[PDB]
Design a protein around this ligand. Sequence first.
Ligand SMILES: CCCCCCCCCCCCO[C@@H]1O[C@H](CO[C@H]2O[C@H](CO)[C@H](O)[C@H](O)[C@H]2O)[C@@H](O)[C@H](O)[C@H]1O
Length: 453
Amino acid sequence: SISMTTKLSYGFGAFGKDFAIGIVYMYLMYYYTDVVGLSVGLVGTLFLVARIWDAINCPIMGWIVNATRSRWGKFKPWILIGTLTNSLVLFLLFSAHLFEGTAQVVFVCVTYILWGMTYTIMDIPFWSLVPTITLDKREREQLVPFPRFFASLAGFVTAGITLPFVSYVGGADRGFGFQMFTLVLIAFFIASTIVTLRNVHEVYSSDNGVTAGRPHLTLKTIVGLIYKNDQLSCLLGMALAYNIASNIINGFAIYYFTYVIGDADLFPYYLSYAGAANLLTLIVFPRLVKMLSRRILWAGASVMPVLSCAGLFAMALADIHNAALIVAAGIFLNIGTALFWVLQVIMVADTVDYGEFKLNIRCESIAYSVQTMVVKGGSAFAAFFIALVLGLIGYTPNVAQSAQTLQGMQFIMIVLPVLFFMMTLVLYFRYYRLNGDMLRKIQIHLLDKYRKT
Ligand SMILES: CCCCCCCCCCCCO[C@@H]1O[C@H](CO[C@H]2O[C@H](CO)[C@H](O)[C@H](O)[C@H]2O)[C@@H](O)[C@H](O)[C@H]1O
């Protein structure tokens, strides 16, 4: 079985990994708009362009990771490089409050696009380690929950005690407190990197002797291996749909909690219950995946946020606000997202296995590049579709609109995520085949095939 040591070390690695990007994801807009003083249009355009650039960069990083040959491995060197460079670029990212004028703008833009690329560097090869740690069904099912739980916990501890830190350390200067807390983030991040590098021992890697990998591959060949691997392209589409839906819902939540307070002091309780639900469902996944089916857990992952959307739709109809319904929708969404992420990591591992099985090529970096680029492109496409719907409904001026227009806009914003969720689950139940007998066939084929020359 997987070493408990390796399980917990991968967990801590994921914790430090997502403890460095939680601050960014959650408060970089607040820093740039409330500490630096930059127009919201600039920040939005930069964020969108940077997410597009990162999505395009992802496959390039996958090609790089597969082609690299080195002593530590083909993942660990890039993991280390990315961790260190991203820590540095993060510190620079939050040191933007120093400059002013065009200098400040250029600094912000450069540091942001860097931070993005740098995080890609290590994000792809990091998650590329689960397929090489093991290729068994239950072993993966009880391996992935550890890093997913630790990542969620990092995000939630950020959400919780990121502001108190910045307040206690130089309360007058918010930028100083930000760049100081960045030091705590960097310390945890580098410690976790060292832990995972020392303890995680890739077993079925693409750079070992018996694997079916080919380090000398072109960018065209690799990126086309996504379409040739029908299951990987199916996962691409499914994850894209789910990410677009989750992004639209999370944006609705941010707009309904920030602009409209919803109710003073509601967000702490909502976040507490959401984190509790997410962490619990991640803890009890190793038992749920067996009590229920993997297919049924995916169905639930896509249906629970749909039930949340329906609840808050019924709410929007009459009840402008019901704290109970709010936190219930939050709990449902969080359970769905936890299930989705765990199953998605396990499934990208299964897809690299199936690619070795069909195309006779083992390439984990490309599957996880697909994962990361889909994460970025989910936000990208959610923004695109929201702008499209706003222009269609007549919100393109953004100066003054009808109350009925706003109500219809809310209704459309609630309905579209449901469309994307039903898309992801129909695609799953109509195209995906890597469950049950198929998985064991692939596993046995690979194991028996691992009998070197
Ligand atoms: C606090 C407010 C309520 C709860 C959270 C908001 C609702 C989720 C809406 C987007 C779901 C896409 O997924 C998330 O994406 C983030 C980036 O990191 C993710 O994406 C990266 C890829 O760029 C890395 O893989 C990283 O490990 C992975 O967690 C992580 O912060 C989250 O935890 C992870 O759920």
